């Protein structure tokens, strides 16, 4: 039903989920950066 409604409204969704993956990438990078700037211990993968 969602892809039906999105194709009915011609919703561009590649830009949407690419944007959401970029935002999640940035938040994971901030969660890794929590370590060296507060605890001052080395990082992970």
């Amino acid at each position: 039903f969602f892809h039906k409604g999105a194709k009915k409204s011609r919703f561009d969704l590649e830009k949407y989920n690419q944007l959401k993956d970029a935002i999640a990438q940035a938040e994971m990078d901030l969660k890794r950066l929590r370590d060296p700037l507060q605890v001052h211990l080395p990082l992970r993968q």
């Binding site: 039903f1 969602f2 409604g5 919703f11 944007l19 970029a22 935002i23 940035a26 901030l30």
Partner: protein
């Protein structure tokens, strides 16, 4: 640079999230309808047998 890019992507989210919420509610209402229609089929199949 990362907290700059995060808010850049947040502002780039800001117009499109509203259209996504509209499509999401518009399809979620249909899913609620088909769930209650499944229960409707079940109640009718009880009654026509009873």
């Amino acid at each position: 640079e990362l907290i700059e890019r995060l808010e850049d992507l947040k502002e780039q989210l800001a117009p499109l999230e509203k259209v996504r919420i509209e499509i999401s509610r518009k399809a979620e209402k249909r899913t609620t309808l088909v769930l209650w229609g499944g229960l409707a089929y079940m109640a009718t199949q009880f009654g026509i047998l009873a």
